[PDB]
Design a protein around this nucleic acid. Structure first.
Ligand SMILES: [Mg+2]
Ligand SMILES: [Mg+2]
Lengths: 249, 740, 20, 708
RNA sequence: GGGGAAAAUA
RNA sequence: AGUAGAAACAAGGGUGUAUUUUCCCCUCUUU
């Protein structure tokens, strides 16, 4: 209802009508990236010298309704912007710290759910057992190993198809899930993702992290499973070998 | 005592201490002015290495063209571009024979890619030349301008979206008598700045209508803009690089796809492998050649770089290679894969910005464009530029120099690598017909070539034969660059092998520091870079810890997030202190919040938020990861999706203003495009995740989606009859609106 | 604990003492 | 035939058919039979779907919920998304191929087929192709014969009759124009997609012009290459080739290499952004005064603690510079500092008055006015910018002494590295102890003092330039150290006046004026101070070991410049530490694996193992691991300070010679092809840079000591 | 799927 | 003057390609 009304409003104009009529869905990719003006190089230098300025951040105007303009020490947090279309506002890191130290607090956070793989990494590291270190001439073999274990029963393309089916059922396309494991994973993820309050794109990305398998060419010596490659920096050295057993099974 | 670091090489082998020979802690050399001088030098050098060729006049562009192929054989060791067509064809025939079916499978894969590829694939490129405005603009902008001009000219074959259709559109455009385009025009107004009280020339840029004849459009389409490469290590003098228009990038992309397909099915090609893969390939080749060598046999390795590699590869030989590779294939595939060499054989290099001229008597300076250099008194240039201009004058037309010979600085890296690999594999026992033989690896211009022979004379004969064959095909070996020793040690593209590849940490020094994206992103990039350098480039444990300490210091200074319990002062200090006295768990605060750094060797692979999650306080944890943080964007399902990112993922202030310039009329187009794209993404939820495809207009697809969604919602019962009727009526009026 | 030392080691001309 | 379809079928139908047929790169003027077939199919589908609605009760009605949802004519993506939505909602099986209509009343997909031959063949073909007893298939024929699945013609007899008469009219029109024969005979290959890509017109002639000399057209060349076979072409051409085209391997014996030929000219002068060994710093102990963090207050306190300022005077004038301007700049700085000290609330930063001396020193109004060429055609006195090569300069002895000083051990700590996480793994403890050793040996190196000085100066200059672009800003060179007593000490080296900093390109420069305190008499090595203008600004009462000695205290004043890239890489000068430490660690590891234990303690404490690091009149000298670490750190720091294209080129072209020498020392029988060319390439990079010249002399010494 | 940073060659 | 080096800055439009490898990130938009 609201979206179709917005589309009608956009179609009311002349230039917008021409853009919407003479541009195909494919060319939507071209005009999405269409950019005018200067491009700033050296992000490191720009951040280095900009942060000394008062307001180096841009936020939505909604921030005006919670973040006060000043704190108890009269330090300005955000200022009204003149070079903006009324939808943005300049913001200082003082605002970020003020939100972190007095902002609204809630007991529900999606970080442990979206980034469950990293928390699994943390748990694996915490319960790991450390052995001794042997200073011996290390021989490194450059081979292709897996940095993301992914799903054993699912391949890369199968995992991508499952992700598309789970997150965007109405746009899967001509693809049809074939493996029984694919269907089981799809229905399990559907059940777990019911009534979720996260954006579909971000859910798709976390599913990609949990399912798709990523492999890279690394110099390894010893273990080859994913649980060992992630820790390769700590258990492998040019002259020293460190015995380690991740807490995972 | 006079401290001499170089004398350290007396004890430690050079390779083991090679890291100290790389001065990567200092700023790299940069170009200060126009690249016109370098472009003219490159054009003159390319024409000088092949001047003994045949001169002709193009019947379309009307510019001189040099064809040195089948020219006189080289008489001395100087660089020569007089490649022999029959020799190249024989080399490719032997490549096919040694790897039967390689070309057939490569052609089949390239056909599959060509038939199932999209036009938007050209938007992956960086700044591209634009003939519409005759200047460098992003790839997306260039493609959009080209498509708009073609549509305005009636050549609407690219609406399909397939890239091959866009190439057919380019073919059609190249046949139009006249082309109507939308260039940028400038208006200059003298104004008085209110901050300096000095007169300046404010500039306003707008759109206008221009008409180009067949010749002008053809010259522009073949034009390759030239600039100067900046931040390039290991060169005392700079060199020029080229960026092609949008009419040449599709064919070049297809040719590069075919060349990559061929190179994948080759054990002597250094591409597309890289990093660890290339090192493994080199080690395998060296080990295999050493093992296969008999005990009495003598093996010698040549580390070699080719001289002026880009300037000695003729596009005509690329066309011959393409034609031979695509034998017994559909005519359309041959044509589409051979168009790119056809255009590169008739390419024109745009000189560039021009020059800067100063009149000290009048105290004035000005910037002459490249177009006026052809009609300027020759006394104004200094001596060297006078020679350059006098030598390159015959090739100037509309501010561009015709350059048929040469590959123009790495436009056919994969095809050139294929040619080099063919010359490499021409050295098997069955082809040398002698006791000596040779083999090795090649990437672009660089090569490692191991030669085995019973005695030193055999090695010399093999090296001479390889050098002569390379000269015949057009490859020139740089004698000064190259050197030969006994097998066991060598170098290949900054990978130093001494009985095993040695780590070179100096190359990865620039990656260290603060990326300047945002607090969390910068921290993650830093820790991950330290971990990867530890794994790959032999960064020690203690050195890794010191790198971590230095990165934390630099990050804290950059983001003014110094520790809360510190006497230091800054704008942010008071808020961090107030947070510090408010938190009971002092180890849960992020470094951006002034918390302690808990990172160490153990947990370089864990993000800080996850690393510090357990020790975080409930209230601080909720505030930090609050679903409604205002600093990150929110997506509507006026309910909005809950955010997950920490408040430290804010968006920094980006500026794009141009000194004394206004572009409102041009930026309104981008604003409208963004609004339409956002509305479409609202209609189609998966557009952001994966690129959509379709020939239907945006409005047609969106109204159809709305209609089907309304029907399906009614069928499921989520809406009653009233909203159904309203949605259908609004869609119908949108439909009639569009139609009329 | 480790104090660096150099076998190769007036008034430190770079950083002298001048307080009266 | 395209004209007939345009003039007969509805504009909506013809447009939709054109859109559907163009989606696969098909031309509508040549491929006309497929166009007509698609138009007929779309018309039949529309008539089948149209004029049929569903009442609220749920029963079919003919004149609201449409009975038939159309799927044909939509794009592949749109059609597939509508099909997916219907499949998800109604729960029916997802069709394998794209259907045409969907019936809600019976909830099934229907495929509409229009054929020219007998119906049974088409129905069997379609049933075999779809291979699914879930989607209904309806074949229509121009001859009036229609067949369905299980003879279930859902559409009412009237609608089927209407479609039949429409098809009969279409067939009669086809026959009347004498084109039904081709229309009937072309149906066999309509389902096949044939790509077309023909080179014609301008591109054809361009192709004709891109062939070897003995070819006239592209087709001739294609025919030649297609029939090409290999028979001794390479061998014959090689035989015809002159024997002078060869790669003779000249042995690289121990007597082959020769010393590099350094340039000749006046000695090279200091070019660093600040003094390195001649710098004097006024220090305050344990800063606990008002401010304590603002550079201006620290500079005030540093200047206050020293008594003995006298009238400045020119002692070593800048040969090309207006020395009185430098003197007046120093006097103006002193006056501004006094004026600020007078006021109570001193500001965080200061802007210097744009006086004449600062106007000249900072190069204000020196660039000629920039004007577009369109308005510069009438000027008859235009000349191209000079592009002359750098003036050659000979190697001087001061750079070696500066490097020697940079490698010295300092009493005061210069870097206080931050904390890290608790160590748990044994490797973590080993890393911690090795890091303690490295920090102790590196935090007390003068190279670290230069690192901190340069980092602070570049950071302050960048901040001032970006924040203040029209102001001549005063920036004191402030550093922080920890003496041997562990007490924080704040040092001031002098002042920097930053000029206008309107930087747009990465190569644009900001002029500034640097005034550095020093105790080095400029007349000892005048050639080293060519660009400076040294003043005698005071008399310092140094506390020598024997007692008190009064020595002149000078102020080296000069005008320098730096760019955005230079400042950026100046901020990232701490990375130099790593460049040494990593290497050092590798060395230790490279030995530890041999001895099966960590040799860090043995290398640092006992100094049993030493590497050849210095040259003395006695001969080559060996330094312990700490000395090697300091030497590498100083080398990297000087690379950062004296960076230039010459250094990069020399390193690149000399790594080859170093590797060749290593191969010779490895008894690998090294060989070269144009070794003289390599020597010329290496020597081309030595022009005037003191650091590059020192490196070249170092390489000469290394070659002398390695050939034996 | 896309965008940024680092390196190598051209 | 100074920076710098085959050409420029020292104010009055701000220039950064092709191929490959690795790392990170997930949405910019009006003086
Ligand atoms: Mg080369
Ligand atoms: Mg090379």
């Amino acid at each position: 209802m609201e979206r179709i009304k917005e589309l009608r409003d956009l179609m009311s104009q002349s230039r917008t009508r021409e853009i919407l009529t003479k541009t195909t869905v494919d060319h939507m990719a071209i005009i999405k990236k269409y950019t005018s003006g200067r491009q700033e190089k050296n992000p490191a230098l720009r951040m280095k010298w900009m942060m000394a300025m008062k307001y180096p951040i841009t936020a939505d105007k909604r921030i005006m309704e919670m973040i006060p303009e000043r704190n108890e020490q009269r330090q300005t947090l955000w200022s009204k912007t003149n070079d903006a279309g009324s939808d943005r506002v300049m913001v200082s890191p003082l605002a970020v710290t003020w939100w972190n130290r007095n902002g609204p607090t809630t007991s529900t956070v999606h970080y442990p759910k979206v980034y469950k793989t990293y928390f699994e990494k943390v748990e694996r590291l915490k319960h790991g057992t450390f052995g001794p270190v042997h200073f011996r001439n290390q021989v490194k073999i450059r081979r292709r190993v897996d940095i993301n274990p992914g799903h054993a029963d699912l391949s890369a393309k199968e995992a991508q198809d499952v992700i598309m089916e789970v997150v965007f059922p109405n746009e899967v396309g001509a693809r049809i899930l074939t493996s029984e494991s694919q269907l089981t994973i799809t229905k399990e993820k559907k059940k777990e993702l019911q009534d979720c309050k996260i954006a579909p794109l971000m859910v798709a990305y976390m599913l990609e992290r949990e399912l798709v398998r990523k492999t890279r060419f690394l110099p390894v010596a010893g273990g080859t499973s994913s649980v060992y490659i992630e820790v390769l920096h700590l258990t492998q050295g040019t002259c020293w070998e460190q015995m380690y057993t991740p807490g995972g099974e | 005592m006079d401290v001499n670091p170089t004398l350290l090489f007396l004890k430690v082998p050079v390779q083991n201490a090679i890291s100290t020979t790389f001065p990567y802690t200092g700023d790299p050399p940069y170009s200060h002015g126009t690249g016109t001088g370098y472009t003219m030098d490159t054009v003159n050098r390319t024409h000088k290495y092949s001047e003994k060729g045949k001169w002709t006049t193009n019947t379309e562009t009307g510019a001189p063209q040099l064809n040195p192929i089948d020219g006189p054989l080289p008489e001395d060791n100087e660089p020569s571009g007089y490649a022999q067509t029959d020799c190249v064809l024989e080399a490719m025939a032997f490549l096919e024979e040694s790897h039967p079916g390689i070309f057939e499978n490569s052609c089949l894969e390239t056909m599959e890619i060509v038939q199932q590829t999209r036009v938007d694939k050209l938007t992956q490129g960086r700044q591209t030349y634009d003939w519409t405005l005759n200047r460098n603009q992003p790839a997306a902008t260039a493609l959009a301008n080209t498509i708009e001009v073609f549509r305005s000219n009636g050549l609407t074959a690219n609406e399909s979206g397939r890239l091959i259709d866009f190439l057919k559109d380019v073919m059609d455009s190249m046949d139009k008598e006249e082309m109507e385009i939308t260039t940028h025009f400038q208006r200059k107004r003298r104004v008085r700045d209110n901050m300096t009280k000095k007169m300046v020339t404010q500039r306003t840029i707008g759109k206008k209508k221009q008409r180009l004849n067949k010749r002008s459009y053809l010259i522009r389409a073949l034009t390759l803009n030239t600039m100067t490469k900046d931040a390039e290590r290991g060169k005392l003098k700079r060199r020029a690089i080229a960026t092609p228009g949008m009419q040449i990038r599709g064919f070049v992309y297809f040719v590069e796809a075919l060349a990559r397909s061929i190179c994948e099915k080759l054990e002597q090609s250094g591409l597309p492998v890289g990093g660890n893969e290339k090192k493994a390939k080199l080690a395998n080749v060296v080990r295999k050649m050493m093992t296969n060598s008999q005990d009495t046999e003598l093996s010698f390795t040549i580390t070699g770089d080719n001289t002026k590699w880009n300037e000695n590869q003729n596009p005509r030989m690329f066309l011959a290679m393409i034609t031979y590779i695509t034998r017994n294939q559909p005519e359309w595939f041959r044509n589409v894969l051979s168009i790119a060499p056809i255009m590169f054989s008739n390419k024109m290099a745009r000189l560039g910005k021009g020059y800067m001229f100063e009149s000290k008597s009048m105290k004035l300076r000005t910037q002459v464009p490249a177009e006026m250099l052809a009609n300027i008194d020759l006394k104004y240039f200094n001596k060297s530029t006078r020679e350059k201009i006098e030598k390159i004058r015959p090739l100037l037309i509309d501010g561009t120099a015709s350059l048929s010979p040469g590959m123009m600085m790495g436009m056919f890296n994969m095809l050139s690598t294929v040619l080099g690999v063919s010359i490499l594999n021409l050295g098997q026992k069955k082809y040398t017909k002698t006791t000596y033989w040779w083999d090795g690896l090649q990437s672009s211009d660089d090569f490692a070539l191991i030669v085995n022979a019973p005695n030193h004379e055999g090695i010399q004969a093999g090296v001479d034969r390889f050098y002569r064959t390379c000269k015949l095909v057009g490859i020139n070996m740089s004698k000064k660059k190259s050197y030969i020793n006994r097998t066991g040690t060598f170098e290949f593209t900054s990978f130093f092998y001494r009985y095993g590849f040695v780590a070179n940490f100096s190359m990865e020094l620039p990656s260290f520091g603060v990326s300047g994206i945002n607090e969390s992103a910068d921290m993650s990039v830093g820790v991950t870079v330290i971990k990867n350098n530890m794994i790959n480039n032999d960064l020690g444990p203690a050195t890794a810890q010191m790198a971590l300490q230095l990165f934390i210091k630099d990050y804290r200074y950059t983001y003014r997030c110094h520790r809360g319990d510190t006497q230091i002062q800054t704008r942010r200090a008071f808020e961090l202190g107030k947070l510090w006295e408010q938190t009971r768990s002092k180890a849960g605060l992020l470094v951006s919040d002034g918390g302690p750094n808990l990172y160490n060797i153990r947990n370089l692979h864990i993000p800080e938020v996850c690393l510090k999650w357990e020790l975080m306080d409930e209230d601080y944890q909720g505030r930090l990861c609050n679903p409604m943080n205002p600093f990150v964007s929110h997506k509507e399902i006026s309910m909005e999706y809950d955010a997950v990112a920490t408040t430290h993922s804010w968006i920094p202030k980006r500026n794009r203003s141009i000194l004394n310039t206004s572009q409102r009329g041009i930026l309104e187009d981008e604003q409208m495009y963004q609004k339409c794209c956002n509305l479409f993404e609202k209609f189609f939820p998966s557009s952001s995740y994966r690129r959509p495809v379709g020939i239907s207009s945006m409005v047609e697809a969106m109204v159809s989606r709305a209609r089907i969604d309304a029907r399906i919602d009614f069928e499921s019962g989520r809406i009653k009859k009233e909203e159904f009727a309203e949605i259908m009526k609004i869609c119908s009026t949108i439909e009639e609106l569009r139609r009329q | 604990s480790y104090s660096p030392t150099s076998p190769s080691y007036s008034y430190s001309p770079t950083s002298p003492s001048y307080s009266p | 035939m395209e004209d007939f379809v345009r003039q007969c079928f509805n504009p909506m139908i013809v447009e939709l058919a054109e859109k559907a047929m163009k989606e696969y790169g098909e031309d509508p003027k040549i491929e006309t039979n497929k166009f007509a077939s698609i138009c007929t199919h779309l018309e039949v589908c529309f008539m089948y779907s149209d004029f049929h609605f569903i009442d609220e009760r749920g029963e079919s009605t003919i004149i609201l919920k449409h009975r038939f949802e159309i799927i044909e004519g939509r794009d592949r993506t749109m059609a597939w998304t509508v099909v997916n939505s219907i499949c998800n909602t109604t729960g029916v099986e997802k069709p394998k191929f794209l259907p045409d209509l969907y019936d809600y009343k019976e909830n099934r997909f229907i495929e509409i087929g229009v054929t020219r031959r007998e119906v049974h063949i088409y129905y069997l073909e379609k049933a075999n192709k779809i291979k699914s007893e879930k989607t209904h298939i309806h074949i229509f024929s121009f001859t009036g014969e229609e067949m369905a699945t299980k003879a279930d013609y859902t559409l009412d007899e009237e609608s089927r009759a209407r479609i039949k008469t429409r098809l009969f009219t279409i067939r009669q029109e086809m026959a009347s124009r004498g084109l039904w024969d081709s229309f009937r005979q072309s149906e066999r290959g309509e389902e096949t997609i044939e790509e077309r890509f023909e080179i014609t017109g301008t591109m054809r002639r361009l192709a004709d012009q891109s062939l070897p000399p003995n070819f006239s057209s592209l087709e001739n060349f294609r025919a030649y290459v297609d029939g090409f076979e290999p028979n001794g072409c390479i061998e014959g051409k090689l035989s015809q080739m002159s024997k002078e085209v060869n790669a003779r391997i000249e042995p690289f014996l121990r007597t082959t290499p020769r010393p590099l030929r350094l340039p000749d000219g006046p000695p090279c002068s200091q070019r660093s952004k600040f003094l390195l060994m001649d710098a004097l710093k006024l220090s305050i102990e344990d800063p606990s005064h008002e401010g304590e963090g603002i550079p201006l207050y620290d500079a005030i306190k540093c200047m206050k603690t020293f008594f003995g300022w006298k009238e400045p005077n020119i002692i070593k004038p800048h040969e090309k510079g207006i020395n009185p301007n430098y003197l007046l700049t120093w006097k103006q700085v002193l006056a501004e500092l006094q004026d600020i000290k007078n006021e109570e609330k001193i500001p965080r930063t200061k802007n210097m008055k744009k006086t004449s001396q600062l106007k000249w020193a900072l190069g204000e109004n020196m660039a000629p006015e920039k004007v577009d060429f369109e308005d510069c055609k009438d000027v008859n006195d235009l000349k191209q910018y000079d592009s002359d090569e750098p003036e050659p300069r000979s190697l001087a002895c001061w750079i070696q002494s500066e490097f020697n000083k940079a490698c010295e051990l300092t009493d005061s700590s210069w870097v206080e590295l931050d904390e890290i996480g608790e160590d748990v793994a044994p490797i973590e403890h080993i890393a911690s102890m090795r890091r303690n050793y490295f920090t102790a040996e590196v935090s007390h190196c003068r190279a670290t003092e230069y690192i901190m000085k340069g980092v602070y100066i570049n950071t302050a200059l960048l901040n001032a330039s970006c924040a203040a672009m029209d102001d001549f800003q005063l920036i004191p060179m402030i550093s922080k150290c920890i003496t041997k007593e562990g007490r924080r000490k704040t040092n001031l080296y002098g002042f920097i006046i930053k000029g206008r900093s309107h930087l747009r390109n990465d190569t644009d420069v900001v002029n500034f004026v640097s005034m550095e305190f020093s105790l080095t008499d400029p007349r000892l090595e005048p050639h080293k101070w060519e660009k400076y203008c040294v003043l005698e600004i005071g008399d310092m009462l140094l506390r020598t070991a024997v007692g008190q000695v009064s020595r002149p205290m000078f102020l080296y004043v000069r005008t320098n410049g730096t760019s955005k890239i230079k400042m950026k890489w100046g901020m990232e000068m701490r990375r130099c530490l790593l460049q040494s430490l990593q290497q050092i660690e590798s060395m230790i590891e490279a030995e530890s694996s041999v001895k099966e234990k960590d040799l860090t303690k043995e290398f640092f404490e006992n100094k049993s193992e030493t590497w050849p690091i210095g040259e003395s009149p006695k001969g080559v000298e060996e330094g312990s691991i700490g000395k090697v670490c300091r030497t590498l750190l100083a080398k990297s720091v000087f690379n950062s300070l004296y960076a230039s294209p010459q250094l990069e080129g020399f390193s690149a072209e000399s790594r080859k010679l170093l590797l060749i020498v290593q191969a010779l020392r490895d008894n690998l029988e090294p060989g070269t092809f144009d070794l003289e060319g390599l020597y010329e390439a290496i020597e081309e990079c030595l022009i005037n840079d003191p650091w590059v010249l020192l490196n070249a002399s170092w390489f000469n010494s290394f070659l002398t000591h390695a050939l034996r």
